[PDB]
RNA sequence: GGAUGCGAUCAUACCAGCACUAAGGCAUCGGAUCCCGUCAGAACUCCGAAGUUAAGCGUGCUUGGGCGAGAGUAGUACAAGGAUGGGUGACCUCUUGGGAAGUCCUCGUGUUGCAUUCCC
RNA sequence: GCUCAACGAGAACAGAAAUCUCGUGUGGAACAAAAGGGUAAAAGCUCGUUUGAUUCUGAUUUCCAGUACGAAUACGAACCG
RNA sequence: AGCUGGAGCCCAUUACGAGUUCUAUCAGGUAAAGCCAAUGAUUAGAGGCAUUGGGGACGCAACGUCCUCGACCUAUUCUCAAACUUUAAAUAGGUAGGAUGGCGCGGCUGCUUCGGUGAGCCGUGCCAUGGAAUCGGGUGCUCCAAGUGGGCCAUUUUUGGU
RNA sequence: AAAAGACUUCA
RNA sequence: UCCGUGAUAGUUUAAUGGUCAGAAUGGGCGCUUGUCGCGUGCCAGAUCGGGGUUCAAUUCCCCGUCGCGGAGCCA
């Protein structure tokens, strides 16, 4: 698409907007739907979960956030079908991006004299994506848990702030299967 | 299942419920207004308490001078028109007659010359007197102000024939005659201001007459007797009576008033640990069981 | 568990609270507001006022204004009134007519009991009887000093209302 | 550019009052006096709008300089700029709350004066000072049933 | 060209130098500004006190 | 302990659902001549004879909820000062300091002044 | 004196909104206006009575030179409500 | 106006003062935390529940039944806030730690008290190193005048702007 | 008196 | 682009002061008419989308989309 370097907004530098009543004009956010693939189960089918953790706290654009997630997906597609493991987005794009807009061609632009000044027109929305955020959360069963090491894999490329992939545990996998049991 | 109410403080729970520590105790249990109450609290002056509905009613009413202080009020007298009949009265006790007296009897004990402090020159225990207008001990009414409390300002009420004999009593509450029950109402004469009617003492006389079940205790007359009573100089009684009996009261209180949890709490948690393994059904309130393993706990394990 | 279980009715039997009868079509829609007087001769006693608020279908622009009036009655006199509108009604019928409360309303026309159409201005083809019916210790709540909530065993429901009124006149 | 200045600006917590304590103010403030000279904790009641003094004047204990009707006067002082004055408000009894600043110190005034007249009684030597923290003392255990165990840091692990 | 509009910096350094200072402490401090009430007890009060002051050092 | 009037501290005092209350008192409750009041004596105001503890009121209970309190809650997060410390910077370590909150888990669930009265 | 925003359940006509009723209801409303606070037997909403939205001349708080001016605060001295 | 100097003016380790700490006590809504706490944003299901949001099937009908899709509701779940916050730091900030004080004695008032009751202010008497720490190669005070009235930079914090 | 215009092919 | 300015029936454009919207023409329907037309009687709105204020907004604000004009140096 047309030029935007994702450095603009990459700094945690400006206050955080999330206030639509004044952030007036903000527009269409951009993944389609969150959460891909099943969603009738949790962890109960899925003992084992893989996450994709923040290294360094950057605002991750929601154009980022989109080809990060449809790559994902399309690998789980193209190498364990269409009802795979299940795919969760679990950081929305709560920052409105402001930004320099209308650029004129005088032999000045940035209009009213060199200013330019707030009063900026809306971009784009970013997500806040601090360190150690679950940006994906890739729920797995353990036996395929290398599919899913590799969607998030290609992903990971595809967004200015760095993360790591770890196999995460919630109360284990190992905790889970005594406390349920011993209740019901 | 539905329900609203219940529901709807229960989820936005602490959001309601604060709302009882908007507002205080005393509001609470309907005692106190504080819009009411902040007037008169900041010269201090004394609290001439009268009820005479919804507080107590249709048995007594109780006139009682009240002075504040920050750690919680002192009566500086208090006489109640159960306590009338110790000096002869056995025509009702809710009626004007009873409260004139009551107002003359607190009066007179309020002083009783005690301690220091004094003012009976002048004429604190004013006379045996056909009224018409406010007698005080000169110039300047204080140190009682008629607190209807919650009751509204009616003329023609019980508060008002409390404040009569207050003023044939000694005592100087500040006044206007123009929501007073008047003169006449403890029967006595009247015919003027924007009141009407000149009896009250004499109400009741009209009523009964006309037959109809009331009162026992006589006849029309009977009232002037026990109003000119009050008046009498022999004050300072109120019964010695026999006291208390051992711990506090009756083996019916100690029966109703205290606890049992702590050690008992934790029976009626066994029984139902047993009853949840033995049965399946409810855990208690509202979902759950299928073994269950204790408390409220079980819930969140118990989801996946 | 109900507190039932004692002997029953001093105080738990019901009574009218108030008879609220009042008329619904609005104002410029039926008249000025001279159907005061068929209102006047029927109870026996004054109607007052009734204003509107919120959204109104219907001219009433203004909202606050007279637009209806209604006549709160009690003692016997209301239940002279409903011994006519129980006649009527079908009887041993319909749970819908009762709430929760444990109050009923019924419509039917003005002109039931001996009375002129010509002598009021107006004959006015009904309007909705509303009765309000509790248990004698409703009087807690009702009255303003020792205002308290209302308790399960103080509740009247739709079908101890109904139980109540089926002894008496239908 | 000359000055203006928004009279309250960031006075929302300020002229608020937490959740809990919203409501009318219990009549004990009302009824609580004070003689001239006494020192006193200013802190508004927000049910009371009228006789308010400024919102940076909160947290400062003054001394009573008269009483009147309804309101009273403290006496408390400003801050910043150059030979800070004290300055006289006009600030409700509702506004007003005492200070245990003042009345925790005076107890131990008296305290000390008790000291005075003991040690005259010895004779003389009085010293009625408040003592600064002093060095430990030694201390003792027993090595007989705490023979050592050993115990470590513990590995990292990432949990996330 | 723009200017500075405002500063708070610098005006601290300069008032701890000379400045703040204290209230001056004194007995009988300003009642200057009091309640009319007082001000005139104290008036005719006085008048008599030194009268009496006299008396009790005899 | 209870009750009543006046409260103080101000959720351990509050919410939900139950349960119990001797004594005496409050209440509910019966009446509408009178002052007073409304659309309606329901409210309000007055009379207080005849009732009823059902509710109010009080107290107790229920893995409750909230509130209060504690924690290896957590020494975490964050943060002043120092570095010719590491790091491209973003930041991150350490030294000299200070140190939360929630999640979550555990324990608690009104106290008490004045006056008068009541247990038996 | 009264209690609201709102919702539920009822009530000829009347529907999603008419008017009427009850319950629940911390303020989620309303208080002229911008916005933000505050506020519940009120400051809201309704009724009743009203005219202090008055007379005098200072002090005090803000802006601040610790100035004027405006506006505010709380008193006094008057006279009223 | 302030900073700066001069001319001094008054005392002098008496005295009080302090870009300070402690102690003890106030005030604060930033960092942060929180969101199944209120407000605002926001993701995902799941499970309920209709005398009236819409479909279909079973029905002559029903105050009928079953699927379905919506609303809502409940317990969850996820992630955020300068103009949100119950909550909530640190570093900063205010006040107090006494002879410019306390106590006893007894005087006056038009105030205040229905009452010498109280309040304030006067005369007279009693109590020292003694009111945490530390320092004051001294401090306090007044008059008058110059210059300045364009600032610039670094670490740290921070707003706009790639 | 002024309101009066159009109107297919073989024909 | 910056500062302005509109939008209302099929089309073209009036109006309000806050409770309320028109006309003309086209079209659709009879009648005129040998038959159409002129003529003659009949009829018909998302007041741009969008929130807010407000009892009540087409009307009074704010934002945005579109369509326009008019300015934008030493060039």
């Known amino acids: 698409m047309g030029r935007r370097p994702a450095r603009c907004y990459r700094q945690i530098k400006n206050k955080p907007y999330p206030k639509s009543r004044y952030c007036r004009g903000v527009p269409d956010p951009k993944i389609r739907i969150y959460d891909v693939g099943m969603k009738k189960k949790g962890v109960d089918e899925f003992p084992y979960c893989v996450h994709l953790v923040s290294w360094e706290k950057e605002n991750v654009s929601s154009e980022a956030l989109e080809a990060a997630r449809i790559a994902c997906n399309k690998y789980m597609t193209k190498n364990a079908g269409k009802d795979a493991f299940h795919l969760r987005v679990r950081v929305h794009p709560f920052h409105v991006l402001r930004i320099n807009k209308m650029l004129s061609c005088a032999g000045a632009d940035r209009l009213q004299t060199g200013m330019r000044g707030a009063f900026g027109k809306p971009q784009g929305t970013c997500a806040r994506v601090d360190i150690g955020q679950v940006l994906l959360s890739v729920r797995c069963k353990e036996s395929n848990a290398k599919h899913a090491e590799e969607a998030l894999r290609r992903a990971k490329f595809k967004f200015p702030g760095r993360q790591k992939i770890i196999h995460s545990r919630k109360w284990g996998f190992t905790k889970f299967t005594r406390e349920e049991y011993v209740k019901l | 299942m539905s329900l609203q109410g219940g529901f709807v403080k229960t989820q936005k729970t602490h959001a309601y419920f604060k709302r009882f520590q908007v507002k205080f105790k005393r509001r609470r249990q309907g005692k106190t207004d504080y819009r009411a109450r902040i007037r008169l609290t900041n010269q201090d002056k004394n609290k001439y308490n009268t009820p005479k509905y919804r507080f107590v009613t249709n048995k007594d009413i109780t006139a009682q001078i009240v002075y504040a202080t920050i750690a919680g009020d002192i009566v500086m007298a208090a006489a109640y028109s159960h306590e009338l009949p110790r000096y002869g009265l056995e025509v009702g006790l809710t009626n004007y007659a009873a409260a004139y007296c009551t107002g003359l009897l607190l009066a007179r004990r309020v002083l009783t010359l005690r301690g220091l402090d004094q003012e009976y020159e002048g004429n604190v225990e004013a006379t045996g007197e056909d009224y018409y207008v406010e007698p005080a001990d000169e110039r300047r009414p204080f140190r009682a102000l008629l607190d209807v409390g919650l009751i509204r300002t009616t003329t023609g009420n019980r508060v008002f024939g409390a404040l009569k004999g207050a003023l044939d009593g000694g005592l100087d509450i500040p006044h206007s005659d123009k929501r007073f029950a008047g003169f006449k109402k403890d029967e006595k004469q009247l015919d003027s201001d924007i009141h009407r009617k000149y009896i009250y003492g004499g109400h009741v006389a009209d009523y009964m007459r006309s037959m109809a079940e009331e009162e026992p205790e006589k006849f029309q007359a009977h009232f002037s007797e026990y109003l000119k009573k009050g008046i009498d100089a022999d004050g300072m009684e109120s019964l010695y009576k026999k006291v208390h009996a051992a711990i506090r009261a009756d083996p019916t209180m100690a029966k109703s008033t205290k606890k049992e949890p702590a050690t008992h709490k934790r029976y009626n948690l066994k029984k139902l640990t047993y009853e949840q393994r033995k049965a399946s059904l409810v855990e208690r309130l509202n979902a759950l069981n299928s073994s269950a393993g204790a408390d409220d706990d079980d819930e969140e394990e118990d989801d996946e | ?170 | 550019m000359p000055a203006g200045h928004g009279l309250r600006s960031r006075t929302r917590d300020l002229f608020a009052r937490p959740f809990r304590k919203k409501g009318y103010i219990p009549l004990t403030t009302y009824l609580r006096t004070y003689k001239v000279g006494e020192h006193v904790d200013v802190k508004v009641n927000g049910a009371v709008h009228k006789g308010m003094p400024h919102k940076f004047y909160h947290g400062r204990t003054g001394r009573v300089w008269n009483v009147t009707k309804r309101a009273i006067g403290v006496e408390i002082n400003k801050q910043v700029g150059n030979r800070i004055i004290k300055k006289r408000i006009h600030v409700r009894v509702e506004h007003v709350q005492p200070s245990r600043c003042n009345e925790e110190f005076l107890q131990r005034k008296l305290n000390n004066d008790k000291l005075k007249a003991e040690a005259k009684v010895r004779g003389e030597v009085i010293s009625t000072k408040r003592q600064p923290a002093g060095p430990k003392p030694g201390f003792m255990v027993e090595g007989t049933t705490i023979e050592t165990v050993t115990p470590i840091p513990y590995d990292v692990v990432n949990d996330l | 060209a723009k200017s500075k509009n405002h500063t708070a910096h610098n005006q601290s350094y300069k008032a701890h130098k000379n400045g703040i200072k204290k209230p001056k402490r004194h007995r009988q401090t300003s009642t200057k500004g009091m309640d009319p009430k007082f001000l005139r007890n104290q008036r005719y009060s006085r008048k008599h006190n030194k009268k009496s002051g006299e008396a009790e050092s005899e």
Not at chain 3, 1 to 24: C, G, W
């Open chain 3, 1 to 170: 568990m109900s507190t039932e279980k004692k002997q029953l009715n001093p105080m738990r039997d019901i009574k009218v609270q108030k008879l609220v009868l009042n008329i619904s079509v609005g104002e410029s829609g039926d008249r000025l507001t001279r159907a005061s007087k068929v209102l006047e001769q029927l109870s026996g006693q004054s109607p007052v006022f009734s204003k509107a608020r919120y959204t109104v279908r219907s001219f009433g622009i203004r909202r606050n204004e007279k637009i209806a009036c209604y006549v709160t009655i009690r003692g016997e006199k209301a239940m002279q009134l409903l011994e006519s509108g129980l006649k009527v009604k079908e009887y041993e019928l319909l749970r819908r007519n009762f709430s929760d409360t444990g109050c009923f309303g019924f419509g039917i026309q003005e002109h039931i009991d001996l009375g002129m159409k010509y002598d009021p201005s107006t004959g006015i083809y009904g309007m909705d009887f509303f009765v309000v019916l509790e248990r004698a210790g409703y009087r807690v709540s009702r009255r303003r000093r020792c205002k308290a909530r209302v308790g399960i065993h103080q509740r009247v429901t739709k079908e101890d209302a109904m139980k109540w009124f089926q002894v008496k006149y239908e």
